[PDB]
Design an enzyme around this catalytic site. Sequence first.
Site, short mmCIF file in Angstrom:
data_model
loop_
_atom_site.label_atom_id
_atom_site.label_comp_id
_atom_site.label_asym_id
_atom_site.label_seq_id
_atom_site.Cartn_x
_atom_site.Cartn_y
_atom_site.Cartn_z
N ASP A 99 9.18 11.76 12.67
CA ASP A 99 9.16 11.50 11.23
C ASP A 99 7.95 12.19 10.58
OD1 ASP A 99 10.19 10.51 8.84
OD2 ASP A 99 9.58 8.43 9.18
N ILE A 117 0.80 -1.22 0.00
CA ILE A 117 0.00 0.00 0.00
C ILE A 117 0.83 1.27 0.00
CG2 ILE A 117 -2.05 -1.06 1.00
CD1 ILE A 117 -1.22 -0.06 3.72
N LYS A 155 4.24 -3.04 8.49
CA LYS A 155 5.50 -2.58 7.93
C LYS A 155 6.60 -3.52 8.38
CE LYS A 155 7.70 1.36 9.09
NZ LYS A 155 7.92 2.83 9.09
N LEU A 213 -5.57 2.70 7.62
CA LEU A 213 -6.41 3.76 7.06
C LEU A 213 -6.34 3.66 5.55
CD1 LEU A 213 -5.99 4.86 10.01
CD2 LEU A 213 -6.39 7.13 9.03
N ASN A 258 3.57 10.38 6.04
CA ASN A 258 3.16 9.81 7.31
C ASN A 258 1.94 10.50 7.88
OD1 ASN A 258 5.12 7.81 7.37
ND2 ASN A 258 6.62 9.14 8.37
N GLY A 283 10.90 0.69 5.43
CA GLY A 283 10.36 -0.54 4.88
C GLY A 283 9.07 -0.28 4.13
N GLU A 284 8.68 -1.27 3.33
CA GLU A 284 7.43 -1.18 2.61
C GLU A 284 6.27 -1.52 3.54
OE1 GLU A 284 8.42 -3.35 -1.28
OE2 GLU A 284 8.45 -1.18 -1.66
N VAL A 285 5.09 -0.99 3.21
CA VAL A 285 3.90 -1.12 4.04
C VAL A 285 2.89 -1.95 3.27
CG1 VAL A 285 2.11 0.10 5.35
CG2 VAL A 285 4.41 1.11 5.13
N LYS A 311 5.24 3.09 0.27
CA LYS A 311 6.58 3.08 0.82
C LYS A 311 6.57 3.80 2.16
O1 LIG Z 1 0.17 3.09 10.02
C1 LIG Z 1 0.56 3.20 8.86
N1 LIG Z 1 1.85 3.46 8.58
C2 LIG Z 1 2.45 3.49 7.25
C3 LIG Z 1 2.76 4.91 6.78
C4 LIG Z 1 3.52 4.98 5.46
C5 LIG Z 1 2.70 4.61 4.22
C6 LIG Z 1 1.66 5.65 3.84
N2 LIG Z 1 0.98 5.33 2.60
C7 LIG Z 1 -0.26 4.78 2.55
N3 LIG Z 1 -0.71 4.21 3.68
C8 LIG Z 1 -1.90 3.60 3.65
C9 LIG Z 1 -2.67 3.54 2.43
C10 LIG Z 1 -3.90 2.85 2.26
C11 LIG Z 1 -4.53 2.83 1.05
C12 LIG Z 1 -3.98 3.48 -0.04
C13 LIG Z 1 -2.79 4.15 0.07
C14 LIG Z 1 -2.10 4.19 1.31
N4 LIG Z 1 -0.89 4.83 1.36
N5 LIG Z 1 -2.41 3.08 4.79
C15 LIG Z 1 -1.82 2.98 6.04
C16 LIG Z 1 -0.49 3.30 6.37
C17 LIG Z 1 -0.40 3.07 7.72
N6 LIG Z 1 -1.62 2.63 8.12
N7 LIG Z 1 -2.51 2.56 7.09
#
Ligand SMILES: O=C1NCCCCCNc2nc(c3ccccc3n2)Nc2cc1[nH]n2
EC number: 2.7.11.1
Length: 280
Positions: free
Chosen positions: A128, A16, A39, A86, A133, A22-24, A18
Amino acid sequence: NLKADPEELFTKLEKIGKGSFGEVFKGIDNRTQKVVAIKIIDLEEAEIEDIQQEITVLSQCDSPYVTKYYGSYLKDTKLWIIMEYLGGGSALDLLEPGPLDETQIATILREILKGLDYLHSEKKIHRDIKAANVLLSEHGEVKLADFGVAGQLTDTQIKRNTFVGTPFWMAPEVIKQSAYDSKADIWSLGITAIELARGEPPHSELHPMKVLFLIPKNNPPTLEGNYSKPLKEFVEACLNKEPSFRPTAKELLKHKFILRNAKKTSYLTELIDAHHHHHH
Ligand SMILES: O=C1NCCCCCNc2nc(c3ccccc3n2)Nc2cc1[nH]n2
């Protein structure tokens, strides 16, 4: 000392975004069948148990403006961090279709500030802050993510001149590894306000090693271009070289840019619509 296997505890679904370090991924907690974000950080070259202990502490945090942590699970050299999911996209994702307007910026900054006020009141530092974020829910709610750990993962490297990560959002005192506190987040907030206004942080065209060198030495960035005087002043207030001269998050919530431009978070669903249209 037999450790639980995170690949059995969680089903890793699609990537979902970067994240820092690390990748998420989207994931499912197999015990509860609930959606989470995951992550995975490769810590082959590194204190792991100190990071896990702090993630446990941070999992007790509880605020509408901050994503939940749900612990972490070590597997060989990889640390699986589990977080609240989210699905609206990060503010960085939502910058892709084009510029944000000042109401969107003020709304997002107001929610960031409430999250910073919470973390700082709990004697935590986000460390960060950047548009990547800052997360939106499908309904437009805004929450800070990936808080409270970047210092443990980078500060020693910065001291050793072995840090090779991205420096654009770091306060000068973090780069110099002098004593830093919550005011470091206020600097990063000012950079993030420029990022939300212009699409990228200052110095984004320069080599990261030049930027690490520049930030503590140069006059602080300012917001240039067709932007309101209150927004420029908000940025200037955050971007003071001296951390004692930066305002607190609680003070910035009263800034006239925030008070006169922030609107309901539900309007930010328009921003999510623009992303869909951009990628349709
Ligand atoms: O707690 C988190 N840290 C990770 C923070 C770095 C990544 C952020 N990029 C992200 N992140 C999503 C996401 C969902 C759906 C479509 C695009 C999305 N793009 N969701 C998410 C991230 C985290 N939780 N949920």
